[PDB]
């Protein structure tokens, strides 16, 4: 299981059709998890500043049970920044992505947890 | 102290009156913390996908100073999924809840922290 | 690098001009990090309750690579609560701020991570 959130000041109208599906597919592929387990959340029109500037930016999070590590996080960032640059026109240097390796016992789903 | 956030694609109009109060009471009861210390945040109308589908779903978080564990998280999930299913018509298998056991020194409140 | 989020039920119109810039500067100063590395996100008009009440409140997070600790978090809360009280008219005792000391390998930026 893995969840990805994108918080951005880019307007809703600038989020292309298929964006959530593309994120789901690329992340399923990158983490090696079936897409059924990937959840995505996009939050446009946000009041944000990066480095004191209000030009396009994004603050993201990827919580995943496993598949988190030095090298994996580097490829995730390359993939994720490429997508935000191409799709939302956000410069890679105006993006932060926080990675969290979740313990299965700390992720609830379907009336229980993954423990 | 504990805080609970629900991010959902369910429309605002579908959130019943008293929903936040019910969450506050059930969580105070479940964690065994006075309700004065429970904070709740509900965020409807979100652009989300779960397993690649945009049917009703929810991504939630419960940050709590203590009261986090294998068995406790399982009961929290049963309680929380039951509420989302009954109140927001969200299927329990389309819900993720991330649990965080916060250190008191890492939770600020009233100009200081709980350390 | 550090990121700060404020989630509040205070209306958008009550957020003064320059609020995001002030937060950026105060946080750069407080953490001793150049402002270029500080990201800020303010989310008004939220459906929230604190202690069961819907009076003005805020649930915040400060994720920082380092500069997180018992004493530092205490000054951060004093600074942050002072700002929310003065700027948004939020009582310090109706504010929670969760502090996260992020590992550099778990923060992506500009196609890679800070590792």
Curated annotation (Swiss-Prot), chains A, B, C:
Induction: Up-regulated in concanavalin-A-treated lymphocytes. Up-regulated in macrophages upon exposure to M.tuberculosis antigens. GO terms for cellular component: cell surface; cytoplasm; cytosol; extracellular exosome; extracellular region; extracellular space; ficolin-1-rich granule lumen; nucleoplasm. The modification N6-acetyllysine is found at residue 78. The gene is MIF. Its EC number is 5.3.2.1, 5.3.3.12. Changing residue 111 to C: Causes formation of interchain disulfide bonds with Cys-81 from another subunit. It holds the Pfam family MIF. One of its GO terms (molecular function) is cytokine receptor binding. Substrate binds at residues 33, 65, 98. This is Macrophage migration inhibitory factor. The active site is at residue 2. Homotrimer. Interacts with CXCR2 extracellular domain. Interacts with the CD74 extracellular domain, USO1, COPS5 and BNIPL. Transmembrane segments: none annotated. GO terms for biological process: carboxylic acid metabolic process; cell surface receptor signaling pathway; cellular senescence; DNA damage response, signal transduction by p53 class mediator; inflammatory response; innate immune response; negative regulation of apoptotic process; negative regulation of cell migration. It is linked to Rheumatoid arthritis systemic juvenile: An inflammatory articular disorder with systemic onset beginning before the age of 16. It represents a subgroup of juvenile arthritis associated with severe extraarticular features and occasionally fatal complications. During active phases of the disorder, patients display a typical daily spiking fever, an evanescent macular rash, lymphadenopathy, hepatosplenomegaly, serositis, myalgia and arthritis.
